[PDB]
Amino acid sequence: NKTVVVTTILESPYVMMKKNHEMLEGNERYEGYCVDLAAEIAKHCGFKYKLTIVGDGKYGARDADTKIWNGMVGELVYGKADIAIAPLTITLVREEVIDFSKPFMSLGISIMIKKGTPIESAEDLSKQTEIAYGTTDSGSTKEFFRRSKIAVFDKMWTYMRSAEPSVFVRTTAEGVARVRKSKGKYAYLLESTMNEYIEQRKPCDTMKVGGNLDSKGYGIATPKGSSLGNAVNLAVLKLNEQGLLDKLKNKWWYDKGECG
């Protein structure tokens, strides 16, 4: 038995530094949905682990020129980590290089606006220019727009890829800050899960509008051929069946919601 190296990302409310993190060591420094999930998975699979934050702060994308994978995906591909326990979207391109457990959370791409912004759908965004809109870099949302053959999403892609100044952000935190400080002139395309969490955080000035653009899920990832995959997949199914995953979502999204 060896300590399993877990790669994850600082993304609220999945993994966050505890307020008193300076007083603590190792795994105890962190808290969140994925921190709780990691503890449950490890217990069910019988392994000890070490939580580590992805070096480049990215989810995972492959460079067009170099063909090299970055982010958490890259850490699994190059063997820097043994497993990824984070809001990592199950996609075809990633499934080609790493393995995923069945989903532990269901979600879809959505729109976040500053309250009062006159936008109710992706269709609305695509038909105008005054309100800028973008996505996070190196993730599944940007890749969705890049590869979409659907007219509305492709129209949106053509605008976003050449928009000036850049409409892309490095992290969810940056996109949220841009929505909040742009006086309604910036809308942010992000996963419904993040959108719903932020909607319940002070200053309660944002909101999710329209239906989700797609239906997909987050999965726990392991390098291809990992001996860990099977047990991890069964653990996820068990936790879902026990209602534990639902309990964890309520805990981190709503029980402590700050917007009444």
Place this chain on the structure above:
Amino acid sequence: NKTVVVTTILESPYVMMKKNHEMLEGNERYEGYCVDLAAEIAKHCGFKYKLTIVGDGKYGARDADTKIWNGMVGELVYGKADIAIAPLTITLVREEVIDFSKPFMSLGISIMIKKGTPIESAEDLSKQTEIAYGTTDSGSTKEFFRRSKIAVFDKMWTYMRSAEPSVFVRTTAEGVARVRKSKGKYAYLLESTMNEYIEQRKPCDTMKVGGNLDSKGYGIATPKGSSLGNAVNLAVLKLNEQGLLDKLKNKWWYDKGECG
């Protein structure tokens, strides 16, 4: 290359006999969401196939005494079929004996009532006796209640397992007929997907109430170790990414909805 034997179930709107089925042969006799899905999967994976309806008309459950698997699950386990393309729920007990692709549809257990029935939640059902309620036999919904540790669902299970006359039905069709003919005295616990489909079918006398009890998905299943699994999983992800699965749901649930 050999013809792949597909096991499926006659369940609207997934697989149904075409009205003019007598005039047709083989795969052409059927139509529906899963019929369309099977054609797409076969095309993407490069195989020819034969659609067959599960002999016992069941989804799949293991006998407590004999330990023998029935339904579509049983057909894969005993090698009577090469793959299952139907609304087969991904569960822990099934994952122990067969393989599943990532989900092609997202859903949850829900409540179906005859319009006007004074029930808005599972909590409501559990606190009364006048309105009987049950589930389909040999499926994931009955197993959910049987294994639940959650107070409300366990209370519901204790009532259902000993209710008289029996509250369990053999098929969705039977449960729907019971809801419709029981004058509000029977509520039916079934997957949200089936519930939403029936809600748009004449005589438009049923409705889904409350939130879903859980969050899970349907997957394409193959016997353990099947050489088909990998390609099938990637095909499902591709179809989802192209928006084809969403298009298919709209086609079979709403485009031809009969309730305005």
